[PDB]
Amino acid sequence: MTTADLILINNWYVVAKVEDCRPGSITTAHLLGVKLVLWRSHEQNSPIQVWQDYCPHRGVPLSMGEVANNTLVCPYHGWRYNQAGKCVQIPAHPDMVPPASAQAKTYHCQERYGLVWVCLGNPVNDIPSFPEWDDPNYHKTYTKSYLIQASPFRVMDNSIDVSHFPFIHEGILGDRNHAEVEDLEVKVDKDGLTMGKYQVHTSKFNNSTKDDSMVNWFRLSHPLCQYCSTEASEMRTVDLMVVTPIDEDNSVLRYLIMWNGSKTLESKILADYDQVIEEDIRILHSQQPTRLPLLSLPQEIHVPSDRCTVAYRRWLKELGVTYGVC
Amino acid sequence: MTTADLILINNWYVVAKVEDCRPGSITTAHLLGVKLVLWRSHEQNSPIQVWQDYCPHRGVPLSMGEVANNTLVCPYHGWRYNQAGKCVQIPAHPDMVPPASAQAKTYHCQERYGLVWVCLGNPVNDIPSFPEWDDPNYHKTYTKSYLIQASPFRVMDNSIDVSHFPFIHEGILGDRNHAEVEDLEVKVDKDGLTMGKYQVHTDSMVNWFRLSHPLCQYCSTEASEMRTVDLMVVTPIDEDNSVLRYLIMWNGSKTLESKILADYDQVIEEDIRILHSQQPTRLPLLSGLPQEIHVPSDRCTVAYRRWLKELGVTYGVC
Amino acid sequence: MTTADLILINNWYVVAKVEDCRPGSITTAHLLGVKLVLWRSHEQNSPIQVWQDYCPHRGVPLSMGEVANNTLVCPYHGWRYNQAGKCVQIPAHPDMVPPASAQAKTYHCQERYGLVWVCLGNPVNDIPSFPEWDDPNYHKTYTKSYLIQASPFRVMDNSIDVSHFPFIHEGILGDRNHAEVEDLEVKVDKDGLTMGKYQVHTSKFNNSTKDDSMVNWFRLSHPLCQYCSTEASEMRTVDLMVVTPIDEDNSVLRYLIMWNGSKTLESKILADYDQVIEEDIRILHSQQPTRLPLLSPKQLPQEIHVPSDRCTVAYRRWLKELGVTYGVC
Ligand SMILES: NC(=O)OC[C@@H]1N=C(N)N2CCC(O)(O)[C@@]23N=C(N)N[C@@H]13
Ligand SMILES: NC(=O)OC[C@@H]1N=C(N)N2CCC(O)(O)[C@@]23N=C(N)N[C@@H]13
Ligand SMILES: NC(=O)OC[C@@H]1N=C(N)N2CCC(O)(O)[C@@]23N=C(N)N[C@@H]13
Ligand code: FES
Ligand code: FES
Ligand code: FES
Ligand SMILES: [Cl-]
Ligand SMILES: [Cl-]
Ligand SMILES: [Cl-]
Ligand SMILES: [Cl-]
Ligand SMILES: [Cl-]
Ligand SMILES: [Cl-]
Ligand SMILES: [Cl-]
Ligand SMILES: [Cl-]
Ligand SMILES: [Fe+3]
Ligand SMILES: [Fe+3]
Ligand SMILES: [Fe+3]
């Protein structure tokens, strides 16, 4: 049984890309300790069902079955479950109405921004906003998924931290000889956590061109999804960073990236993200304790450039998070 | 050393094939949480000793030793144990009589049907009967062993289940156009659990089976021109792991042996795919989160769960 | 960060050889459940720092950093720690004085006999003596380190046991035609555990005794370091056996060996030790329970003891008397 807090259960999380879930497909995923099955009927534009991956007859994963005639069919005795999760046929007794108990545990699913979002509980909140999604001046791309052996809150803590840039992203986002961090603007309010415009010192790459001089800001409406905005020399790049909380100690990381420069930059964008992400994963894998320490092994130390990661920890306690934190 | 229920401790289980326990040999097995050593002296027709795999001096497995002169010799300090498990020689003190505590933990062992049977407790029952063993009209063959990451009681539950045949054994035991299951006849007695004759569809065979005890099943199938029986024996390694073996006998042509073994292998591997996936691992008795649902074609597997609860089984179940 | 008994925490243990800690190097070790980082400046004859492998800012291992300008630099935000473990530079705030909390957890470290000794607590004893260290008639050599999946107290128990020699070390320390064990002399007092001189059967002629044997004795001042002496044919070999208690169930084993015979014996000595150690590891890995059983007023079945077990019984009795509960059962 999931020990996640209600505040986490009642939120939306990404579990897959829509483009990887074809009609007729069966996909597995994991969310807040729960094993999920995602399936679609073979019809074009069919919805995605997201259920607990478990047949209540003899305990077989329904994901080992098959999709047929708009049902998911268990492999073991062939019980057929309709789109609402109700068993509508037991082959051993074809004239018998299946018992009302023969029902899959179903969850909420929405497709948004080409991503599959799931809510295991009763969705109080909305899916986070992504204003550029419907802007045709912006192209889109998606990173691969990254499976990370770290708490989802440590993953997000690292992506709120800006002072590490000249050290583990040396050569892309700065150098150890330019590591001073200016005062940061941070607010935690009704819109969530927002880091105000911050100047990022970048390493020179193309000697023919002007300095990149990027300015970054971001906002988290909810604690595992970050909207990030970067203004560079002649282009804006935005992204939605979504962390899937597999369990307390493990995460999946994905980005949806949009930019209003040339579509031909997609390869460079994906490779630059991959380089930065893997540098962060080396740190994340190593951090102890695995779960994120909240405010109160020696205690964490905080300096002024930690203002936003301190605010993140404060927010998590205000939210009542106990899962994935310590 | 085992924490299994007395009702399980006092029953017989197969742990090896006799052909693998040659004179002079040392082999191992694992039963109800206990590590076992099996050994024989080099004399022809010597008996098989089955002991806990543990030298009580400094805790080394006796299976790392050697068989010498009707004794098993521990590799660490060379203490020698005779066929009764009594230490008869301590090399550091060759004239000393070894203390009474210098004694291997021994278990009951009987060879039957070409199989090595072990009882860790006090045998209250005989080894299950297999009447065709003495019928020379029937040929015999043995499957290989199958190591399964599932509770032994889930392994047997899967074998008692007949309604899954059309879905995971299509072409050998079932037909997806004939998935309906007729009314089943099941009885639980002091003779054990018995399922009455049942039509299989694959032609049309008639099958029945009986379990005298919960982890050994006698199965009988009559086809057009042939009867096939088997003894299915499941070694309960622990609560969560099993060894599966079959002794198969049939009264048709001797030439059918390789096809019989191939068909069994196909069916067994199809079942193992399901067994490895089932959660929870241990077999739920009557009373993933939701509780089991039962329909009429589950009559025999429901009776099996009821029998285990009546017997007081708590090991390997939930 | 350790559940070890105070009697173990306040003792010295070897965690590395000095030759594996070159100037500028970062290495790791593990002691009583604590992850350690060992580092030195690039300077000639720089000291060895041994710290908990942990940056208290955001919990990254300092062993993932780099040595620069006689400081250890954390890879994540570049905090620089001096040889005393004090943070002297926070690059995000270059003119700010680091808070007093910005300090690595440091441990007592000493180099002796070419080995790196560490005490995680407050050392009550000196490092064991090794008198031949100063003697110019003795050559020295070092085995490699051996990682063993067994309790450090089982590792030492196996090294105090002599009656197994004819059975698992046949041809180096005994043979099965010479398996009888003489009455053993054992004492446990202020000096620790001592086994008195006893005869080990070999294959080479001893010119002092006029048969194929050697004379061995050993002493443990503390439960995980053994001084061992062996004499045959006018040549003497001594060693210091040091066990690193990684945690309750795992060990590192090292030997420092000195001998007064030919320098050409060195490779033979190393090969003999490697064979004997691997023979013992085969047994150690198989033993159950993993932790060393102590003696109990009571009655898996309890161990059995015979007279040739006198010194390993004394070892178990000593550990109970000392109050050891970690790595034993
Ligand atoms: N050019 C490039 O790789 O940018 C990465 C992109 N921009 C940041 N400032 N990052 C800091 C942390 C981070 O996760 O890498 C990210 N945060 C979000 N949302 N997207 C990333
Ligand atoms: N032709 C073939 O593979 O038959 C398998 C054989 N016969 C059955 N009806 N089975 C159903 C289940 C089962 O375990 O496979 C088995 N039960 C026993 N005792 N033997 C097997
Ligand atoms: N020639 C050779 O390999 O000798 C091993 C050497 N000498 C002993 N008598 N041993 C007995 C046990 C043991 O651990 O192998 C050891 N104990 C210590 N201190 N050093 C080893
Ligand atoms: S386990 Fe799913 S139909 Fe029986
Ligand atoms: S451990 Fe078996 S003889 Fe010593
Ligand atoms: S974690 Fe070491 S400097 Fe930040
Ligand atoms: Cl469909
Ligand atoms: Cl579609
Ligand atoms: Cl019906
Ligand atoms: Cl023999
Ligand atoms: Cl035959
Ligand atoms: Cl049985
Ligand atoms: Cl001590
Ligand atoms: Cl000494
Ligand atoms: Fe980063
Ligand atoms: Fe089957
Ligand atoms: Fe030894």
Residue numbers in the entry:
A (entry chain C): 1 to 296, 305 to 334
B (entry chain A): 1 to 202, 212 to 296, 304 to 334
C (entry chain B): 1 to 299, 305 to 334
Q: What do the study's own words say?
A:
The remaining GxtA interactions are formed between β-STOH and STX with Asp239 and Gln226. Gln226 and Asp239 interact with the guanidinium of the five-membered ring of ddSTX, β-STOH, and STX, and Tyr255 interacts with the α-hydroxyl group of STX, which is installed by SxtT. The most significant structural difference between these substrate-bound structures of SxtT and GxtA is the orientation of a loop that connects the β13 and β14 strands of the C-terminal iron-binding domain.
To investigate the architectural parameters that dictate the substrate specificity and site-selectivity of a Rieske oxygenase catalyzed reaction, we focused on two Rieske oxygenases, SxtT and GxtA, which are involved in the biosynthesis of paralytic shellfish toxins. Each structure showcases an α3 trimeric architecture, and each protomer of the trimer contains a Rieske cluster in the N-terminal domain and a non-heme iron center in the C-terminal domain.
